[PDB]
């Protein structure tokens, strides 16, 4: 996970370059800047290698001591986590808006019985977000999110949604 949530208190990624483009000094190094932010004094904050970190929780976000002797420390510019349209595992928790199947067929709305009559109504699956015609995996089947299809010859089909890469 190379994105930050909020100010990146939980950031444990591998970015090692500051906002202005300076290579980070290793946390366990005293060169060029002497400091006390050592891994042994900040257990759980993962002050490893020279990765940008926010061990105390400050505004700018994750930061590091810089290899430039003239710049003691500088914040790093890491993108905010914005991933959405992806699935974790087989997507029991998927609640995005993909509405086409793996074969390219437009999904039938869950509350519609046309062309396919079925039982997967929102009122019978409260909490599964069977809204609009979005792909869903309400019963937790290994096929991933699926939908009834608008092709009268294809009752249902799993959709094609890639795995996430920013969850944890």
Residue numbers in the entry: 4 to 171
The authors write:
In this work, we describe the rational design, production, and characterization of K1K1, a novel minimal MET agonist consisting of two copies of the kringle 1 domain of HGF/SF in tandem orientation. On the strength of the structural, biochemical, and mutagenesis data available, we rationalized that a covalent dimer containing a tandem repeat of the K1 domain of HGF/SF could constitute a minimal and stable MET agonist able to diffuse effectively across tissue boundaries owing to the absence of the N-terminal domain of HGF/SF responsible for high-affinity binding to heparan sulphate proteoglycans (HSPG). Therefore, we designed a linker to bridge the distance between the C-terminus of the first K1 domain and the N-terminus of the second one. We chose for that purpose the four–amino acid long linker, SEVE, which is naturally present between kringle 1 and kringle 2 (K2) in HGF/SF.
The collected datasets enabled the determination of the molecular structures at 1.8 Å resolution and 1.7 Å for K1K1 and K1K1H6, respectively. Both proteins crystalized in space group P 1 21 1 with K1K1 having two molecules per asymmetric unit and K1K1H6 having one. Structurally, K1K1 and K1K1H6 are nearly identical with a backbone root mean square deviation of 0.8 or 1.8 Å, depending on which of the two molecules in the asymmetric unit of K1K1 is used for alignment with K1K1H6. Both proteins show an elongated “stretched-out” conformation with the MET-binding sites exposed on opposite ends and the N- and C-terminus located at the centre. Surprisingly, like the revelation of seeing the first structures of NK1 that presented a likely biologically relevant dimer, both crystal structures show a pseudo C2 symmetry around a central axis and present both receptor-binding sites in nearly identical orientation on either side of the molecule (located around residue Glu37 in the first kringle and residues Glu120 in the second kringle, equivalent to NK1 residue Glu159). One can envision a binding mode in which two MET receptor monomers are brought in proximity by binding on opposite sides of K1K1, forming a 2:1 receptor activation complex. Alignment of the first kringle domain of K1K1 with one of the two kringle domains within the NK1 dimer places the second K1K1 kringle close to the position of the kringle domain of NK1 protomer 2. However, the straightened conformation observed in the crystal structure of K1K1 “misaligns” the second K1K1 kringle domain through a rotation by 109.7 degrees and a translation of roughly 14 Å. No contacts between the two K1 domains or the kringle domains with the SEVE linker are observed. The linker is more stretched out compared with the two NK2 structures supporting our idea that it is highly flexible and therefore allows significant conformational freedom. This flexibility was confirmed with SAXS measurements of K1K1 in solution which generated an envelope that perfectly accommodates K1K1 volume-wise but only in a bent conformation.
